[PDB]
Amino acid sequence: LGKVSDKSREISEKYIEESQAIIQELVKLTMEKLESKFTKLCDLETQLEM
């Protein structure tokens, strides 16, 4: 059981490295979709001032 728990814990550490490699993609992909709304928000700087 100690040989199995320690086998699972490096597998648990293997999925931790699997975890943040997806999360570091999600921060990037959120930005371009947010950047789609910056240029939408920057239009309202001129349209409302008209």
């Binding site: 040989k3 199995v4 320690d6 086998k7």
Partner: peptide, 26 residues
Amino acid sequence: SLPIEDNYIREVVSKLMECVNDAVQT
């Protein structure tokens, strides 16, 4: 060509070691 009795016709008629060797190490 004589018929035969019906109760006579009814009368005539690696995967282990792949898991064990993995179970001894961990």
